[PDB]
Amino acid sequence: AQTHALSNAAVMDLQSRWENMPSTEQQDIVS
Amino acid sequence: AEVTQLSNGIVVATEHNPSAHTASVGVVFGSGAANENPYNNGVSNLWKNIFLSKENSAVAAKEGLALSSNISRDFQSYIVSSLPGSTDKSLDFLNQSFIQQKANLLSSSNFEATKKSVLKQVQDFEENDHPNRVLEHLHSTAFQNTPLSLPTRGTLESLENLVVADLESFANNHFLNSNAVVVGTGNIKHEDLVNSIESKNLSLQTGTKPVLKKKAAFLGSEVRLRDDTLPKAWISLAVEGEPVNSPNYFVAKLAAQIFGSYNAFEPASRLQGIKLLDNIQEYQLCDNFNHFSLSYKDSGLWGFSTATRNVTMIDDLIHFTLKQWNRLTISVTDTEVERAKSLLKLQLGQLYESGNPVNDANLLGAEVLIKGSKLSLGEAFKKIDAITVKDVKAWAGKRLWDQDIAIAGTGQIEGLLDYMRIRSDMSMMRW
Amino acid sequence: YTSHLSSKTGLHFGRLSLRSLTAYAPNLMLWGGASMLGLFVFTEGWPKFQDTLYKKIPLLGPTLED
Amino acid sequence: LTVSARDAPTKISTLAVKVHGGSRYATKDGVAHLLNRFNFQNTNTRSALKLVRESELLGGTFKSTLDREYITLKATFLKDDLPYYVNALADVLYKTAFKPHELTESVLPAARYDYAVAEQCPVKSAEDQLYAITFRKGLGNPLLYDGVERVSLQDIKDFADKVYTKENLEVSGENVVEADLKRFVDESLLSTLPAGKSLVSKSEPKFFLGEENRVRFIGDSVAAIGIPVNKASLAQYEVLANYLTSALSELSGLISSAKLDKFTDGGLFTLFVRDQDSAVVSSNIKKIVADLKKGKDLSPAINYTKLKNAVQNESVSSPIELNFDAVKDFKLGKFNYVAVGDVSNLPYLDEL
């Protein structure tokens, strides 16, 4: 629904370590 | 009085027991602290708290039913107790206010009040409790860089950095139907067996749980928080236990129950016991024991927790406990094993058959998710008498002998020698 | 067990029991074995002990000739 | 000596003997607790542990709790180990030894430890003060030996012979077949204890209301309140206690406890307020008492109270079946007060 200010632990986890994220919410966050 | 399980979309289990008359129905989600990343820790805590406050206020005011919860590593045991003749209402409320809809629940005001309450609660837990703190630290130090070390409560930095979107995202990535069940421990028979599967009474978010990239590991470490302000001391050894669903669960449980608990300020505990308790009691060395062998679906922990009072005499307590563990893996009297078998039998009987339906419901949910089928205690008793000295010798020759340990305590630990005076003396050079 | 459990007391000279000695018997036996092994290791210059050691191990220790 | 039991398919069981004595019936104040801590050790027939460690070796454990009027002794065992436990329990309930030189080292340090860890928390102190100031030297007494009087072994033995007797006794165990116990007490020493007299009370204990006390404890402040309740109207206070302690009403995030201790023919409605500071407590208790005195409708909590009461029961000796239907309203009348911790800020009774 066009979320604004997507500022959760998800983005910090993204910048820190992307490869270790379990290849499943990657599509959700890029979407 | 026999547990029944099936598989129709959502697993439904039932442990009928017309002994008690407090019917309980709820859910046992197969995810929790282990199924979530370090950066967003207390999401499960926040879920549990928003539920336990506002839904409690709703249910008691409307009807008569008191709702509880529990999170240990990978459960959200949202058990909703009720009367024996009031299970349909409980199920209807659970499916109308937990799975959906979440709009009337996650108002910004209620969420924020619960957020500040959770912050206060975790803060005073950090400032007051101690054995639980060292246990959580032991988990956090045994499983570094692994989705099992993060605690079941969370860190203030991780607590503060989440408002709505993270909560809803975790809800939609873990409140599915594939790994969620229904538990009806109490005195219901088959109404729950048919009413869970109805025209619409079903959890939303069809799909599967996102599989974790890495499961679990182990490595020796220390996390001590030396502060002389606190009066007493606190330590907690640990050796990697045996995971659930393995032919080593009960033998490890017995190997833990041999040494047993101990409370130095009780007239009915000092007199009884085995070698270490006597050799401690001659002087004053320790004040509490807790031999615990906790197990999880990824890996288990065999631990040894104390909270002493003497400060100069930590080394001797550790040395004696280690020599006793070596004695366990080198030679055990038959009477010791028989006594352990009897004690563990009665302990299991008390734990699994306590009158409170909530405990039985939570344990049934844990087993049905992990084992895939409930293990009635009859088979446990049948297979527990077969445990013999040779088996325990063999098991301890693997889990205990020269295996890396992890300890973590807060208080006046300073007297404790760092690593090679508590590790390289598990064999005493004469086996 | 209704009611008497018919307990029996094992032999013991205070602390050591028959169970412990039965458990430790092979241990002490080959500890003595290892002790004598190290004893053979330590002694090498005795002409008597060297003479005894020469014959028993002839495919590894034929070292006497000048 | 009437006994009762219930059959259970589960294969773990426990037997309890419920001596109808305790703090209330103690002639000297600090004897009930010391006796109870003196109970399971050193029978004349068999040694203190040389023939009681075999209980753990045989698959069962011993426990001897305490209450306001119950010297309860419990033992949890497997199904096939019953007669030995009945015989051992009857032997301990045989005023056997009470050896003199096994008190200055056995139980007194345990009593001191128990008192020290039970007096740090101001909740317990508030309970004790409230009971003493409401009941005088009747039902109320110090639940714990604090050493204020020297109590002699002669007095302990006198109390034991006063309470431990066949007529004033009761035995109940769960997951045990009825016939086994009904014919096993008689095949044991429990048939030989002298028949004393039932120490029960015919009428309600005398209560005192209005008075208040204070102390100067060093720690968190607590402001207990108490009510006297009689058996004729005891449902209302239970339903109100659960109404308060729950999350149903707004007075939930500040109260600490609102339990209702139950006696034979009465009890004390208690409640608590506690905080780290010494200023929030005053305002909190002021608004609580003002709103309670205002008078709140109480019916829409009956189902919750019934559920909590039913789930609370775990013992075979079920309490009287309370009638939770004649509850319509409530309006506070006269009460009591105890203040612990700091006093300079806590409100007096006049302006409450």
PDB file of N, CA and C in Angstrom, chain B residues 6 33 48 58 60 64 115 144 153 167 210 244 254 261 266 279 334 365 386:
ATOM      1  N   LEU B   6      -4.041 -35.614  13.806  1.00  0.00           N
ATOM      2  CA  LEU B   6      -4.401 -35.823  12.412  1.00  0.00           C
ATOM      3  C   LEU B   6      -3.658 -34.789  11.575  1.00  0.00           C
ATOM      4  N   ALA B  33      11.611 -16.972  19.038  1.00  0.00           N
ATOM      5  CA  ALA B  33      12.901 -16.295  19.112  1.00  0.00           C
ATOM      6  C   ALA B  33      13.897 -16.889  18.126  1.00  0.00           C
ATOM      7  N   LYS B  48       3.092 -10.802  22.227  1.00  0.00           N
ATOM      8  CA  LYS B  48       2.534 -11.439  23.408  1.00  0.00           C
ATOM      9  C   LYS B  48       1.944 -10.403  24.346  1.00  0.00           C
ATOM     10  N   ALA B  58     -10.679  -7.329  26.831  1.00  0.00           N
ATOM     11  CA  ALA B  58     -11.879  -7.612  26.050  1.00  0.00           C
ATOM     12  C   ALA B  58     -12.585  -8.866  26.552  1.00  0.00           C
ATOM     13  N   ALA B  60     -12.405 -10.768  29.413  1.00  0.00           N
ATOM     14  CA  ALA B  60     -12.987 -10.820  30.747  1.00  0.00           C
ATOM     15  C   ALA B  60     -14.267  -9.998  30.810  1.00  0.00           C
ATOM     16  N   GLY B  64     -16.388 -15.096  30.314  1.00  0.00           N
ATOM     17  CA  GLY B  64     -15.507 -15.614  31.339  1.00  0.00           C
ATOM     18  C   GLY B  64     -14.462 -16.557  30.792  1.00  0.00           C
ATOM     19  N   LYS B 115       4.268  -0.709  24.242  1.00  0.00           N
ATOM     20  CA  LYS B 115       5.696  -0.601  23.982  1.00  0.00           C
ATOM     21  C   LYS B 115       6.429  -0.054  25.198  1.00  0.00           C
ATOM     22  N   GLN B 144      26.842 -17.846  19.247  1.00  0.00           N
ATOM     23  CA  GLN B 144      27.171 -16.587  18.593  1.00  0.00           C
ATOM     24  C   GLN B 144      26.941 -16.680  17.091  1.00  0.00           C
ATOM     25  N   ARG B 153      13.467 -12.210  25.254  1.00  0.00           N
ATOM     26  CA  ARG B 153      12.922 -10.921  25.652  1.00  0.00           C
ATOM     27  C   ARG B 153      13.350  -9.794  24.727  1.00  0.00           C
ATOM     28  N   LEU B 167       6.226  -5.359  12.758  1.00  0.00           N
ATOM     29  CA  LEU B 167       5.345  -6.297  13.438  1.00  0.00           C
ATOM     30  C   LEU B 167       4.439  -7.015  12.443  1.00  0.00           C
ATOM     31  N   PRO B 210       9.469 -19.141   5.997  1.00  0.00           N
ATOM     32  CA  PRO B 210      10.773 -18.944   5.347  1.00  0.00           C
ATOM     33  C   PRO B 210      11.858 -19.706   6.092  1.00  0.00           C
ATOM     34  N   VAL B 244      16.014 -32.532  20.410  1.00  0.00           N
ATOM     35  CA  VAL B 244      14.798 -33.332  20.451  1.00  0.00           C
ATOM     36  C   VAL B 244      14.754 -34.243  19.227  1.00  0.00           C
ATOM     37  N   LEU B 254      18.545 -38.360  32.255  1.00  0.00           N
ATOM     38  CA  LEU B 254      19.001 -39.111  33.419  1.00  0.00           C
ATOM     39  C   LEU B 254      20.405 -38.698  33.837  1.00  0.00           C
ATOM     40  N   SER B 261      19.085 -31.418  41.989  1.00  0.00           N
ATOM     41  CA  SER B 261      18.996 -30.099  42.590  1.00  0.00           C
ATOM     42  C   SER B 261      19.510 -30.130  44.025  1.00  0.00           C
ATOM     43  N   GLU B 266      17.874 -25.890  53.478  1.00  0.00           N
ATOM     44  CA  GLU B 266      16.697 -26.709  53.710  1.00  0.00           C
ATOM     45  C   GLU B 266      17.080 -27.923  54.547  1.00  0.00           C
ATOM     46  N   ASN B 279      30.547 -33.583  50.090  1.00  0.00           N
ATOM     47  CA  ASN B 279      31.873 -32.976  50.104  1.00  0.00           C
ATOM     48  C   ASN B 279      31.795 -31.456  50.084  1.00  0.00           C
ATOM     49  N   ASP B 334      25.451 -48.907  40.435  1.00  0.00           N
ATOM     50  CA  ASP B 334      24.139 -49.317  39.949  1.00  0.00           C
ATOM     51  C   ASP B 334      23.023 -48.661  40.749  1.00  0.00           C
ATOM     52  N   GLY B 365       1.792 -29.043  22.452  1.00  0.00           N
ATOM     53  CA  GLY B 365       2.090 -28.299  21.241  1.00  0.00           C
ATOM     54  C   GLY B 365       3.545 -28.417  20.840  1.00  0.00           C
ATOM     55  N   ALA B 386      14.775 -49.334  30.458  1.00  0.00           N
ATOM     56  CA  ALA B 386      15.820 -49.983  29.683  1.00  0.00           C
ATOM     57  C   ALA B 386      17.145 -49.238  29.734  1.00  0.00           C
TER      58      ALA B 386
END
